[PDB]
């Protein structure tokens, strides 16, 4: 019977539904989960809204199961609701086309500002419960707004000696359910592994239900962690194999990421000329709407069509790129390298990379920085019990004589930067 | 990574030329089940993927009929045409698919007869004209004059003894592949059965591959039709059971259709104030963009957010309804009736129905008066297949329901609304509603 294709019919707590039936939350119906993936995989039409519901539901399943199996952990009806709301809201902060936006646009548009989508999820959440008087409703259901709002934000963004103020250290395991940076395993990934496979037509053999059934809390170096039964390791292999498959075959897809950087090139050439209306009446730009949640609420995938359909001559440059995509005259792939050693090209350095490439004296045609797009692309210690970064360059010039030239600058840049030699 | 239903499909270069086109790319922004998304989180698919599927499926079937029966003389040209027809049959869908030609246009412009297939045919003509596809068809063995006719025809049926001008009667079976109004079975339905189930989380047991493998053409009353092996009837039951399930459980979903009528109420209250730019510079309205394909190309699901995010005070009324939906203060369900054994409700009559309901004097005098503006009434509409035996091949072996909603949500008003409704059914001779 018609429900979520992955979790089926989920029924939620009235508090959870209050949070959902909200414009700050509904906002997620208009954010492609895999962003520019849609333009390469027809199946991938899902948005963060469904995903978010998934993670909320899954967060609850796990906490509630840990509770039943181990009453000694003293997991409360309150603790559960909090974890659910955290899973529910962890993605509130995603901007147009998901990771493309905090990952590439903002660092190109505003290199000085450190902005992450989780920061945004925390502001967006605060603004959500403020603009909808959710606080009186939390109190109604046994929540302590002061202590718990802290707890919720904390499990979304980490700490804002024992770092956290939302829960004591003896309930530390609750901080590994929605976001687990250490062991990679959280209910967040479980959901999006399941649906990215479901829409990409990829085999997914991980069984989170089985995993949840056999999960437990236990001491690991005098610290409480979520462990998995040893006889559950074959299921864990099946997960990581899926993670590796979604990555190798979809998230790193050659043309898929090319398109992503074109869409970003469109937004940039349009940033000056699109006004988003914020609090008070004040107007913001795409890149700057992150400064006010009133406006950010209205910054979704819509912005793409707003440019596409525009008639403004100021926006002709942007329109033309978005029109490149419909026709499929994409930027041309020039090659791939990765940094040897430890170093990762830092986000603040993105804006300058094309200036660098274009300045590389190779050992016919001259190319300028405007002709190069370079995008940086980034991404077994689990506990049991018994009963990196790759750089691709594209060229905006599509003629044979220019690509040969572009490859020449690229190979040299890798040379005098000490990145791995590209493959012919 | 490919289509989750057909996997990796590779298409003819002509097909790709048609696809890499703004008139076609338009379909990336039309929710397949329209207002279904706001009730089933899974249903985020658009007509673009669907269209590709039907294109691909149209080809599979034609090409298979061809190999099994060379005597039918099915050409490389005949195949390409059927593929393009399947590929373009949905070009004319407007914002939120069926919600638009089925309800908005009949409320917005009751005088005009508009169907989405008409629009698919104009949109297609405009597509191959705006992208110089015709020189490319000739390049691949197509006869633009004869074939463009053929394509349009299998999308909209005869544009006017043997009705069609695109193909002779001896290749009549080609006209039952993409759109089959008679027996219900076409590759169109097969695709959207498969993906509506795939996104709705519904079991779909029909196996179109098996069906395609055992399909054949054969004489049925001196007419060439596509028949199915008799031993394929259990697969056919599995199909119809899925059709009925997608209908009972999803396409007729109580709250799903309510939301659809609110979105329609929003577009209507916004129709005056949104301008769409067409050919020449001329400006059109939502309801009127169907008169010019330049503008229609730019009429997609975007129009929804354009209203939602709008700051215009003229558009405050519309905004408020779309905001009703985010908050989930929906119109309230009042009841269901059908016109069993009565004359059905024609599309031209939709605009007048609320005036009727509101004018129905109920038997007992009611503590509240309601006006037409307070009622939303929506009309909701929707085994003779031919078989053959291995032995002797080549020869063959509800309708409309009306629901009423109320825009007033207080208890004392709903009770009133139900009263008008029950009476309207009375003096209209529709079935008595269920308590
Ligand atoms: Zn997530
Ligand atoms: Zn269709």
Query: β-pairing, A384-385 with B215-219?
Result: unpaired
A200: nearest CA partner in chain B: B1
Determine if residue B231 is labeled as part of a ligand binding site. Answer: yes
| Parallel/antiparallel/unpaired status of strands B387-388 and B224-229 | parallel
Break positions in chain A: residue before each gap, C to N over 2.5 angstroms = 160, 363, 379, 387
Concatenated DSSP letters of A225-259? EEEEEGGGHHHHHHHHHHHHHHIIIIIT-HHHHHH
Closest Cα in chain A, distance from residue B112 (Å): 27
Q: How far apart are CA B110 and CA B350, in angstroms?
A: 8
Coil, helix or strand at residue A327: helix
> Which residues of chain B come before a gap where C and the next N are over 2.5 Å apart?
160, 382, 397
Q: Does residue A270 share a domain with residue A370?
A: no
Write down the H helix ranges in B371-410.
none
Residues B66 and B132 in one domain: yes
Please report which ligand is nearest the Cα atom of B30.
2
Among residues A37, A87, A5, which one has the least CA distance to residue A250? A37
Binary contact (A2, B202; C-beta < 8 A): yes
Instruction: Single out the residue in A300, A329, A358 at which a domain terminates.
Output: A329
Q: Which of A309, A110, A329, A347 is nearest to B29 (CA)?
A: A309
Count other C-beta atoms under 10 Å from residue B414's C-beta. Answer: 17
Please give the Cα distance from B280 to B282 (Å, whole number): 6
Of B32, B92, B402, the residue nearest B252 (C-alpha)? B402
* CA–CA distances in Å: residue A122 to residues A90, A126, A152, A163, B177: 8, 6, 9, 17, 53
**CA pair distance A4, B202, nearest whole angstrom:** 10
Dihedral-angle region of residue B222 (phi above 0 means left; psi in -120 to 50 means alpha; beta otherwise) = left
CB atoms within 10 A of CB A381: 6
φ, ψ for residue A337, nearest 5 deg = -145, 165
Nearest residue, CB atoms, B52 vs list A42, A199, A323: A42
Does residue A176 share a domain with residue A36?
yes
Residues A321 and A280 in one domain: yes
What is the maximal distance between C-alpha atoms in chain A? 74
Nearest residue of B to residue A309, measured between CA atoms: B298
Contact call for residues B202 and B55 (beta carbons, < 8 A) = no
Distance from CA of B200 to the nearest CA of A (A): 5
Chain B residues near residue A1 by CB distance under 8 angstroms:
201-202, 249
| Phi, psi values for residue A381, rounded to 5° | -90, 55
Interchain CB distance below 8 Å, B201 and A45? no
Q: Which residues on neighbouring strands pair with residue A336, listed in sequence order?
A: A392
Q: In DSSP terms, which residues pair with B226 in a beta bridge? A: B217
Backbone angles phi, psi at A102, to 5 degrees: -90, -25
- Contact by Cβ (8 Å): A385, A230: yes
C-alpha A387 to ligand 2 mean position (Å): 54
**Lookup: tokens for A349:** 């350095």
Residue of B1, B247, B297 to mutate for A, most A C-beta atoms under 10 A: B1
Domain that holds residue A91: 1-329
Q: What is the DSSP string of A4-39?
A: BTTTBS----HHHHHHHSSHHHHGGGGSBTTGGGGG
Could you list which residues have their CB under 5 Å from ion ligand 2? Answer: B 90, 188
Q: Annotate A168-228 with DSSP letters as a single string.
A: -GGGGGGGGSS--TTTS--HHHHHHHHHHHHHHT------HHHHHHTEEEEESSSSEEEEE
- Report the CATH number that the domain containing residue B368 is assigned in CATH: 3.30.70.2760
Cα gap A407→A335, rounded to integer Å: 7
Based on the fold, state whether residues A31 and A150 are members of the same structural domain. yes
Give yes or no for A41 touching B (CB within 8 A).
Answer: yes
Give the chain A residue whose CA is nearest to the CA of B30. Answer: A45
Q: Is A36:A259 a contact under the CB 8 Å cutoff?
A: yes
Contacts of A344 (CB under 8 A, 6+ apart): A378, A388, A389
Choose among A5, A26, A249: nearest Cβ to B198. A5
- Our count of domains for chain A comes to 2
Number of other CB atoms surrounding residue A295 within 10 Å: 22
B382, B376 contact by CB (below 8 A) = no
* β partners of residue B381: B400
Q: Kindly calculate the radius of gyration of chain A based on its CA atoms and give it in whole angstroms.
A: 23
Q: Which of A329, A347, A364 is the last residue of a domain?
A: A329
Q: Are B44 and A47 within 8 A, CB to CB?
A: yes
- Tell me the torsion sign for CA atoms B337, B343, B347, B352: negative
Dist CA A305 CA A326 (whole Å): 12
What single string gives the DSSP state of each residue in B263-329?
HHHHHHTTTTT--EE-GGG-EE-GGGGGG-HHHHTT-STHHHHHHHH---STTHHHHHHHHHHHHT-
Query: Per 3-state DSSP, what percentage of chain B is helix, strand, and coil (rounded to 5)?
Result: 55, 10, 35
Q: Which of A7, A46, A117, A241 is catalytic?
A: A117
- How far is A25 from A11, CA to CA, in rounded Å? 17
Experimental method for this entry?
Answer: X-ray
CA B390 from centre of chain: 36
CATH number of the domain where residue A81 is located: 1.10.3210.10
User: What CA–CA distance (Å, rounded) separates A96 from B304?
Assistant: 17
Do A308 and A375 reside in the same domain of the chain?
no
Rounded distance between C-alpha atoms, residue B55 and residue A230, angstroms? 49
Please indicate if the annotation marks B405 as binding a ligand: no
Half-sphere exposure for A312 (CA within 13 Å, toward CB) = 15
Query: For residue A72, what are its two tokens?
Result: 């000694």
C-beta atoms of A22 and B327 within 8 A: yes
CB B401 within 8 A of CB B337: yes
Strand A283-284 versus strand A276-277 pairing type: antiparallel
The B residues from 144 to 203 touching A (CB cutoff 8 Å) are 198-202
- Residue A407 to residues A349, A361, A395, A424: CA-CA distances in angstroms? 21, 12, 9, 10
In this complex, the residue of A5, A26, A30 whose CB is nearest that of residue B201 is A5
Is residue B351 domain-shared with residue B303, that is, in the same domain? Answer: no
Q: Which residue has the tokens 């609320």?
A: B354
Neighboring chain B residues of A286 at a CB cutoff of 8 Å: none
How many Å lie between the alpha carbon of A46 and the closest alpha carbon of chain B? 6
Tokens of B356: 């009727």
What part of B 245-284 touches A (C-beta under 8 Å)? Answer: 249-250, 253, 277
Task: State the distance between the two ends of chain A, measured CA to CA, in whole angstroms.
Answer: 52
How many CA atoms lie less than 13 Å away from A55 in the CB half-sphere?
Answer: 27
CA A152 to chain centre: 18
Q: Are the beta carbons of B90 and B120 closer than 8 angstroms?
A: yes
Question: Is residue A232 domain-shared with residue A271, that is, in the same domain?
Answer: yes
CA distance A145 to A135: 6
Give CA angle at B93 (B128, B148), nearest 5°: 30
- Among B236, B240, B304, B285, residue whose Cα is nearest residue B31: B304
What torsion, rounded to 10 degrees, do the Cα atoms A282, A285, A289, A295 define?
50
**Neighboring chain A residues of B52 at a CB cutoff of 8 Å:** 42
Q: Given the structure tokens 């050919």, which residue do they identify? A: B279
Whole-Å CA distances, A385 to A70, A226, A227, A231, A382 = 15, 10, 6, 9, 10
DSSP B31: B
Q: How far is the CA of B413 from the centre of ligand 2 (A)?
A: 40
Shared-domain flag, residues B254 and B105? yes
Cβ A127 vs Cβ A27: under 8 Å: no
If 0-12 CB within 10 Å is exposed, 13-18 middle and 19+ buried, where does residue B429 land? exposed
Q: Are residues B90 and B112 in the same domain?
A: yes
Compute how many other C-beta atoms are within 10 angstroms of the C-beta atom of residue B355.
12
Query: What is the biggest distance separating any 2 CA atoms in chain B, rounded to whole angstroms?
Result: 75
Which residues in chain B touch residue A278, judged by CB atoms under 8 angstroms apart? none
On whether both A325 and A386 belong to a single domain, the answer is no
How many helices (H) and strands (E) are present in chain B, helices listed first? 18, 8
Contact A335, A95 (CB under 8 A): no
Angle in degrees, 0-180, between the axes of helices B254-268 and B302-309, rounded to the nearest 10: 70
Q: Which residue in chain A has the smallest CA separation from B42?
A: A4
Handedness of CA A88, A90, A96, A98 (dihedral sign): negative
Q: What CA–CA distances, in Å, run from B351 to B34, B282, B343?
A: 21, 28, 17
Phi-psi region of A131 (alpha: psi -120 to 50; beta: other; left: phi over 0): alpha
Secondary element (H or E) of residue A136: helix A135-140
Q: How many CB atoms lie within 10 A of CB A385?
A: 15
Distance between CA atoms of B15 and B34, rounded to whole angstroms?
Answer: 26
Residue B34 neighbours by CB distance under 10 Å = 25
| Resolution at which this structure was determined, Å | 3.1
Pairing of strands A384-385, A224-229: parallel
Looking at chain B, how many residues does it have? 435
Closest CA to A128 of A97, A106, A152: A152
Question: Do A329 and A381 meet the contact criterion of CB atoms below 8 Å apart?
Answer: no
Determine the 3-state secondary structure of A155 from DSSP. helix
**How many CB atoms are located within 10 Å of the residue A76 CB?**
12
Q: Is A199 marked active-site? A: no
Instruction: State both tokens at B90.
Output: 């949905």
Which helix (H) or strand (E) segment is B375 a member of? strand B375-381
Residue A162 neighbours by CB distance under 10 Å? 11
Token pair in block for residue B310: 């709008």
Q: Which whole-number Å values give the CA distances from B261 to A217, A343, B257, B290, B433, in the listed order? A: 50, 56, 6, 20, 21
CB B224 within 8 A of CB B170: yes
Domain's final residue, options A282, A302, A329: A329
User: CA–CA separation, A352 vs A205, rounded Å?
Assistant: 42
Minimum CA–CA partner of B45 in chain A: A45
Residue A125 makes CB contacts below 8 A (sequence gap 6+) with: A24, A89, A92, A152, A153, A156
Q: What stretches of B328-386 show up as alpha helix (H) in DSSP?
A: 353-358
* Domain co-membership, B152 together with B94: yes
- Contact (Cβ atoms closer than 8 angstroms) between residue A342 and residue A330: no
Strand order in the sheet with B375-381: B332-337, B400-406, B375-381
Task: In whole angstroms, give the CA distance from residue B57 to residue B54.
Answer: 5
Ordered alpha helix ranges (H), B2-46: 13-19, 22-25
Q: What is the three-class DSSP state of B357?
A: helix
Distance between CA atoms of residues B405 and A167, nearest Å: 47
Strands A224-229, A215-219: pairing is antiparallel
Contact (Cβ atoms closer than 8 angstroms) between residue A148 and residue A80 = no
Question: CB A298 to CB B309 under 8 A?
Answer: yes
Which DSSP letter does residue A98 get?
B
Spatial contact of A35 and A100, defined as CB atoms under 8 Å apart: yes
Is A160 exposed, middle or buried (CB count within 10 Å of its CB: 0-12, 13-18, 19+)? exposed
């Amino acid at each position: 019977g018609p429900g979520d294709p992955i979790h089926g019919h989920i029924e939620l707590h009235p508090l959870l539904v209050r949070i959902i039936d909200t414009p700050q939350f509904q906002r997620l119906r208009y954010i492609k989960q895999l962003g520019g993936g849609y333009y390469v995989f027809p199946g991938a039409s899902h948005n963060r809204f469904e995903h978010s519901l998934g993670v909320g539901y899954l967060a609850g399943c796990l906490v509630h199961a840990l509770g039943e199996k181990q009453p000694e952990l003293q997991i409360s009806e309150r603790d559960v609701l909090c974890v659910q709301i955290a899973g529910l809201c962890h993605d509130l902060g995603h901007g147009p086309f998901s990771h493309m936006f905090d990952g590439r646009f903002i660092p190109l548009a505003r290199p000085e500002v450190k902005w992450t989508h989780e920061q945004g999820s925390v502001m967006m959440f605060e603004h959500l419960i403020n603009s909808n008087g959710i606080k009186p409703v939390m109190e109604q259901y046994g929540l302590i707004p002061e202590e718990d709002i802290c707890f919720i934000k904390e499990q979304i963004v980490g700490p804002l000696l024992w770092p956290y103020k939302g829960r004591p250290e003896n309930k530390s395991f609750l901080y590994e359910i929605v976001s687990n940076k250490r062991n990679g395993i959280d209910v967040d990934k479980w959901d999006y592994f399941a649906r990215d496979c479901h829409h990409l037509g990829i085999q997914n053999n991980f069984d989170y239900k089985r995993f949840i059934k056999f999960a437990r809390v236990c001491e690991v170096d005098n610290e409480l962690r979520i462990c998995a039964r040893d006889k559950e390791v074959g299921n864990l292999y099946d997960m990581f194999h899926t993670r590796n498959s979604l990555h190798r075959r979809a998230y790193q897809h050659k043309v898929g990421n090319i398109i992503d950087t074109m869409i970003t090139d469109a937004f940039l050439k349009a940033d000056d000329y699109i006004e988003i209306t914020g609090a008070g009446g004040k107007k913001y730009r795409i890149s700057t709407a992150i400064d006010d949640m009133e406006a950010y609420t209205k910054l979704t995938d819509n912005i793409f069509l707003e440019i596409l359909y525009s008639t403004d001559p100021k926006l002709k440059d942007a329109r033309e790129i978005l029109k490149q995509i419909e026709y499929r005259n994409l930027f041309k792939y020039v090659g791939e390298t990765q940094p040897t050693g430890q170093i990762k090209i830092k986000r603040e350095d993105y804006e300058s990379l094309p200036k660098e490439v274009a300045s590389a004296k190779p050992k016919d045609v001259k190319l300028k920085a405007e002709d190069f797009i370079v995008d940086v692309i980034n991404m077994d210690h689990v506990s049991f019990y018994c009963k990196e970064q790759l750089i691709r360059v594209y060229c905006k010039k599509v003629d044979r004589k220019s690509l040969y030239a572009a490859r020449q600058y690229f190979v040299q840049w890798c040379a005098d930067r000490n990145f791995t030699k590209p493959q012919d």
